[PDB]
Scaffold this active site. Structure first.
Site, PDB file in Angstrom:
ATOM      1  CD  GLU A  88      30.524  12.809 -17.328  1.00 52.13           C
ATOM      2  OE1 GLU A  88      31.404  13.527 -18.130  1.00 52.13           O
ATOM      3  OE2 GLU A  88      29.225  13.343 -17.556  1.00 52.13           O
TER       4      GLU A  88
ATOM      5  NE  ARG B 269      30.454  28.062 -23.810  1.00 50.79           N
ATOM      6  CZ  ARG B 269      30.095  28.897 -24.497  1.00 50.79           C
ATOM      7  NH1 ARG B 269      29.029  29.115 -24.868  1.00 50.79           N
ATOM      8  NH2 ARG B 269      31.265  29.464 -25.221  1.00 50.79           N
TER       9      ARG B 269
ATOM     10  CD  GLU C 153      32.582  16.416 -16.318  1.00 50.02           C
ATOM     11  OE1 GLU C 153      33.523  16.902 -16.835  1.00 50.02           O
ATOM     12  OE2 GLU C 153      31.589  16.773 -16.663  1.00 50.02           O
TER      13      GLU C 153
ATOM     14  CD  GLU D  43      28.853  16.278 -15.204  1.00 48.62           C
ATOM     15  OE1 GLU D  43      29.016  17.434 -15.172  1.00 48.62           O
ATOM     16  OE2 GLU D  43      29.774  15.584 -16.099  1.00 48.62           O
TER      17      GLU D  43
ATOM     18  CG  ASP E  72       0.379  -0.177   2.701  1.00 47.49           C
ATOM     19  OD1 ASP E  72       0.065   0.700   3.422  1.00 47.49           O
ATOM     20  OD2 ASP E  72       1.342  -0.662   2.034  1.00 47.49           O
TER      21      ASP E  72
ATOM     22  CG  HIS F  57      25.229  17.300 -20.712  1.00 46.00           C
ATOM     23  ND1 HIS F  57      26.268  17.251 -21.620  1.00 46.00           N
ATOM     24  CD2 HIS F  57      25.438  18.294 -19.671  1.00 46.00           C
ATOM     25  CE1 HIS F  57      27.102  18.236 -21.192  1.00 46.00           C
ATOM     26  NE2 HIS F  57      26.447  18.960 -20.026  1.00 46.00           N
TER      27      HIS F  57
ATOM     28  CD  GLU G  23      25.519  17.543 -24.547  1.00 50.83           C
ATOM     29  OE1 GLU G  23      26.146  18.120 -25.072  1.00 50.83           O
ATOM     30  OE2 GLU G  23      25.926  16.824 -23.367  1.00 50.83           O
TER      31      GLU G  23
ATOM     32  NE  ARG H 135      25.334  22.257 -23.084  1.00 55.77           N
ATOM     33  CZ  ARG H 135      26.552  22.025 -23.330  1.00 55.77           C
ATOM     34  NH1 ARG H 135      27.518  20.940 -23.223  1.00 55.77           N
ATOM     35  NH2 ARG H 135      27.167  23.030 -24.293  1.00 55.77           N
TER      36      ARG H 135
ATOM     37  CD  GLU I 207      26.846  13.615 -22.124  1.00 56.71           C
ATOM     38  OE1 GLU I 207      27.133  12.677 -22.857  1.00 56.71           O
ATOM     39  OE2 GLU I 207      27.202  14.728 -22.309  1.00 56.71           O
TER      40      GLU I 207
HETATM   41 MN   LIG Z   1      27.403  16.268 -22.830  1.00 57.40          MN
HETATM   42 MN   LIG Z   2      30.853  15.680 -17.961  1.00 56.15          MN
END
Ligand SMILES: [Mn+2]
Ligand SMILES: [Mn+2]
Ligand SMILES: [Mn+2]
Ligand SMILES: [Mn+2]
Ligand SMILES: [Mn+2]
Ligand SMILES: [Mn+2]
Lengths: 468, 468, 468
Positions: C220, C339, C212, C131, C50, C269, C357, C359, C129
């Site tokens: 990562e 970016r 990373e 990390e 439950d 990401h 992607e 991110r 992806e």
């Molecule tokens: Mn990436």
């Molecule tokens: Mn990375």
């Protein structure tokens, strides 16, 4: 008067006016006023603040009847001079009277003065005998993960084994055996002696002081009887002074009823009697001196004993003392001996001073509510007949059941007591000395604590219940 | 006058002149001048220093209008005698006026005196009620690897369990329950009592002092109302004195709004009203006494409440108090009760003193900006109509949404508040009491902190967010 | 199949079946079943338990669709053999479907399979992806009196000065500088290497692992793309394995987005693209390869970016990373570079694999909701036109305002994000993949945390706000 207070103000210089002033459904409170600000207006219209401790929905400011501007004095203790000058509740407001959800000092009087409007008599005397504990260190706490408390004070047996450096010196009183034994053994006097001086300084009258019976600092100071409203408020000082010198000496003082187990937890016996002119209608013939009148009183209490101890026996602890003793006064009868018996009509001599000692009440109540409720009942007995019957003189102990079982009990146990009051309302409610609220609010409060206490699991429970 | 100051200088010997003088976009500052150096010239042309705290590109020296050479007094505290003698900002320079990117004390007056050039009235009184915290140890820090803070002061429940040596002594106030309970329990008075003496010594008028409601040293000292510029600057002392005796006693004093969680974080209520001749045009008939006039005021605030609290509610902490309570005053309405309600028109009596208490402001603002902005608005309401509507009298609590949701809020949350001000500009900007800059610079500052605060991850976040 | 599972059961002996099974509005859960008890019935009618975590008023038992009895495997880690065999939510009950107030794995599919009923395509691939951080000691707490947290792990600069005994040995990575530098310096591999082995053992496909960029153990591990429902659930393992080896090695592993300040807080990401037959309708001509289709997607996200990050960016911490960087991807545009830009259309080569992607998402979301919502939107764009416009290629930095200010933002800040979702409902709600509830409940939850976080005062606030 103020005119007066007024001098006193200069008599001493003083600045500030405060310590002890309001006092809660529970006990004692203050606010500090710069010396000026005092001045008639002040004396005549008061000052006002608001809510907090009993109060619902916004803004109910309450006048602070700067009052019993009699009940005014220089507090030793605070730094710079200042007239501790109580206040008669907050009066109300514009109506000007029963402070919101109380006015304990008020209720006092309603009661008191109400008494007066019956004729049952003219003046009610109360002479409480409050005991207190004086220890050195008091640590405790509780929280999800655990709970606990520890008490210590050179004295309390326990400490012998304890190592010191100036080292042991070993004279101290072992469990129920703090019995006026002379000094080396007596944590000390100077603390009491001292407390007296100030007590009187503050304005009470001391009658004798000494060590009560408990391993670790049970001390008692006695004080001459009064009028509920006065005496009640005297307890308020009696306390402030203890707490304080005690602390000023190096100790913590505590009016809890049963700090430790297997010792003596202070209790506030209360002696009483009403008088008409300069005649205490409590006297006469028929049992131990006394008189018809008294009996209805002895009646009254006994009748609502439970509801009363809800009033004059709070915080749970209260009842860890009001555990069936034989020693312990949980019987609802009267005796002149055969204790166990919660009502003692002490011997007498001069009818001049014949009284009633109802011992069960513990240093923990607003002398106000307590006294009130004591009285309030006392006379509803005095009032509509109501009759004691016979005294005990046959201590508890009778084929436990053998109706000894049957026998009326001192309502041992809060929730229970709480209840009583919920139902008893009446005899309180009568006169106005006690609103439904008051009663309600009151209950409502004690209620919470009662809870916090039972929801929180107890060290012992592990003792016994753990490994199951 | 100076002629005067001049005596005083000899009246007391004194050497040096300083403590409290300038005061930032934030709060308080000083510089010390050898006793000589003072002399008219000084009184008439000032002294000048430069930039630092708000200032851009080189050399903008600023005259220091050795001024309100009234606002002059012997600071207890410093060692050797010295006349703490404020300064009216830096005046400017040769123009001689609004200190670079401010002149908080200036703005004050622009406002103030500007008020005067409207006719809406002649004098604005402000009576702030700032509370503060008095604790023993305050440790904290933050850094790549961690962050934290700890607070302690015998008192604050927490400490019971704590072991001492003179040992526990256990009388102290448990969480929201620091309520004027008499001493043993009251960390102490002498610190307050004392603070008063000096407060007055410094020149303010004390009206009463006492313990507010928080487990660990919430103390409040009250002070008689004034004129924005004066009172504002009185807060400046009120503070210096607290900080100092407090420290001189053994404690740290802190005007932060919410030092701890689940307790009471001091707040600076501000009471106000303007008057013409010896008539407070805040009075009349129509709701709780009061008058048309007032209402536009009640209007004004309510209108730019947000922009104001950006001014009278900084550092982030500010808002951890201005969290929706019910207790907590975040509603934009007025009442005479039904708190929750951020504007309280206290009962009154003598129309002689009818006012407005806008409570939300916290001990953290330059009384200057705050007061100013309070006023500044107040009258733009007073000014172009603007109308309260009805009071609350129906505490928050209404099908949360049920438009109770709809209901205007106290702009809880800096960034937000910051914003408002960015847009509200206007009503501030009006009169000259407030340049774009001023506003800008101001914002611009609070901005940074707001950042440092959100970029730095919070202990709790680990609590809840870690193991995901 | 079960028939199968059935073998496997004997293939390995095994007893018990559990670890990872249900999974909350938040993340991961299990219950253990004795080896027997499994048997078809079981496979066909489930098992049921439950409420608890989302559920209101009594007894809503939920079938546990012992399912994706594919998603079944021997957990290394537990003691005695056992088939960790997920469950497809609790199905409902007798209706048998969306688990009460969720069924994250369900929603997944509704989405997924719903996708399928549009025709926009046939299969959606997701390749997140994620990390994570690998440290040694993690201590923190908070409470009335204080708050705090500390992090340590040989590595994280801070530790150099630190004394050890085998002593220092000093090779470690200093703040943003954990950059695949070879060993001595690399806390270690074996932990990663190892995690892979098991990851695959558990059934995922590893593509490369490495350090990373963060002073103190940012690691990562990459994993080959899938189908939302599968991949999402792969994250569920990806996590369990990390947490565990990490712990089995001697460390704590944490998917929090911003454990420390001035370092790198892992982020998940998410790369994606849908395909029809063996054709990814994400390809074509027109900008960086890609195609019309894609653009509406790029549209979709960008459109409800905020609502999504409410879903794929919880716990407050989330946003301490989603702080305007330049580095930090908070812009709502697409680029193939530039970016700052929250949508990267990586270069490509073979149209065979052209993708998107997005991110911003952080290791903290139920891959389920997140993915779902990602998709769900993506195609409502793909759906009713909706069009990207141009890519960035002009990093943030433009007369900050200069409409660079104007420029669409990644909804930085929970409350805010929370809101969006309250309003965006729609595009989620569409298909059935998302009930009002679901949405509601969800919000409703994150709400609390958001609160606990802001009510609790922050170490830094003292930093800056204390001495005021
Ligand atoms: Mn990436
Ligand atoms: Mn990375
Ligand atoms: Mn005794
Ligand atoms: Mn006695
Ligand atoms: Mn206050
Ligand atoms: Mn107030």
């Amino acid at each position: 008067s103020a005119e007066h207070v007024l001098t006193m103000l200069n008599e001493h210089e003083v600045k500030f006016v405060d310590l002890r002033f309001t006092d809660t459904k529970g006990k004692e409170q203050h606010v500090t006023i710069p010396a000026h600000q005092v001045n008639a207006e002040f004396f005549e219209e008061g000052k006002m603040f608001d809510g907090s401790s009993i109060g619902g929905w916004k803004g109910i400011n309450e006048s602070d009847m700067v009052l019993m501007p009699d009940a005014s004095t220089a507090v030793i203790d605070p730094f710079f001079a200042d007239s501790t000058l109580i206040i008669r509740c907050d009066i109300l407001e514009p109506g000007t009277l029963q402070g919101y959800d109380r006015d304990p000092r008020s209720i006092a009087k309603r009661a008191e003065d109400y008494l007066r409007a019956t004729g049952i008599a003219d003046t009610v005397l109360f002479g409480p005998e409050p005991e207190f504990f004086l220890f050195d260190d008091i640590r405790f706490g509780a929280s999800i993960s655990g709970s606990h408390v520890a008490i210590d004070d050179i004295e309390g047996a326990w400490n012998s084994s304890t190592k010191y450096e100036g080292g042991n010196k070993g004279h101290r009183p072992g469990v129920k055996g703090g019995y006026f034994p002379v000094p080396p053994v007596d944590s000390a006097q100077d603390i009491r002696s001292e407390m007296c001086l100030v007590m009187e300084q503050m304005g009470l009258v001391v009658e004798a002081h000494h060590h009560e019976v408990a391993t670790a600092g049970q001390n008692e100071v006695a004080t001459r009887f009064n009028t509920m409203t006065k005496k009640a408020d005297e307890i308020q000082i009696y306390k402030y002074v203890v707490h304080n010198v005690a602390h000023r000496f190096g100790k913590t003082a505590t009016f809890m009823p049963k700090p430790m187990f297997g010792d003596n937890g202070s209790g506030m016996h209360c002696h009483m009697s009403l008088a008409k002119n300069g005649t205490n209608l409590f006297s006469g013939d028929k049992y131990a001196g006394l008189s018809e009148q008294a009996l209805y009183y002895i009646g009254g209490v006994i009748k609502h004993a439970k509801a009363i101890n809800a009033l004059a026996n709070p915080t749970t602890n209260s009842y860890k003392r009001l555990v069936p003793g034989y020693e312990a006064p949980v019987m609802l009868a009267y005796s002149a001996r055969n204790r166990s018996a919660s009502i003692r009509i002490p011997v007498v001599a001069s009818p001049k001073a014949r009284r009633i000692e109802v011992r069960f009440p513990d240093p923990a109540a607003n002398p106000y509510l307590c006294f009130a409720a004591l009285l309030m009942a006392g006379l509803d007995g005095i009032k509509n007949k109501i009759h004691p019957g016979e005294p005990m003189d046959k201590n508890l102990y009778d084929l436990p059941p053998e109706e000894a079982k049957e026998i009326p009990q001192v309502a041992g146990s809060l929730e229970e007591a709480l209840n009583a009051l919920d139902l008893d309302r009446e005899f309180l409610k009568a006169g106005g000395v006690f609103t439904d609220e008051a009663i309600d609010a009151y209950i409502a409060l004690r209620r919470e604590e009662d809870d916090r206490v039972r929801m929180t699991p107890h060290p012992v429970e592990f003792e016994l219940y753990y490994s199951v």
